[PDB]
């Protein structure tokens, strides 16, 4: 929604779109994107870095790494 109520990370939409694609494609990573996304929705801190996602074991180091790499790519490319 266009309502900026609750600072939801750029990580939120990524975990949402990857899990959504994973539900349509049959990707097994759908489950790891879920437990990460649910953790973020119950966590009142806007994760700006994968360093901040690292403390959350629900994500895991692989998940935290992907998010931080994507955060880098997006700012560099404008979109994605």
SS3 of the chain: the string is CCCCCCCCCHHHHHHHHHHHHHHHHCCCCHHHHHHHHHHHHHCCCCCCCHHHHHCCCCCCHHHHHHHHHHHHHHHHHCCC
Measured from the Cβ of residue 73, the count of other Cβ atoms closer than 10 Å reads 10
Identify the structural domains of the chain with CATH numbers, from first to last.
Answer: 7-80 (1.10.150.110)
Q: What's the CA angle centered on 32, arms 27 and 36, to 5 degrees?
A: 135
Determination approach: NMR
Measured from the Cβ of residue 63, the count of other Cβ atoms closer than 10 Å reads 24
**To 10 degrees, what angle do helices 30-42 and 61-77 make?**
80
């Amino acid at each position: 929604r266009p309502l900026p109520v609750c600072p939801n990370p750029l990580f939120v939409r990524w975990l949402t779109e990857w899990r959504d694609e994973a539900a349509s494609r049959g990707r097994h990573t759908r489950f790891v994107f879920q437990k990460a996304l649910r953790s973020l929705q119950r966590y009142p801190l806007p994760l700006r870095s994968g360093k901040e996602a690292k403390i959350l074991q629900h994500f895991g180091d692989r998940l935290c790494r992907m998010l931080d790499e994507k955060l880098k790519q997006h700012l560099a490319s404008g979109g994605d």
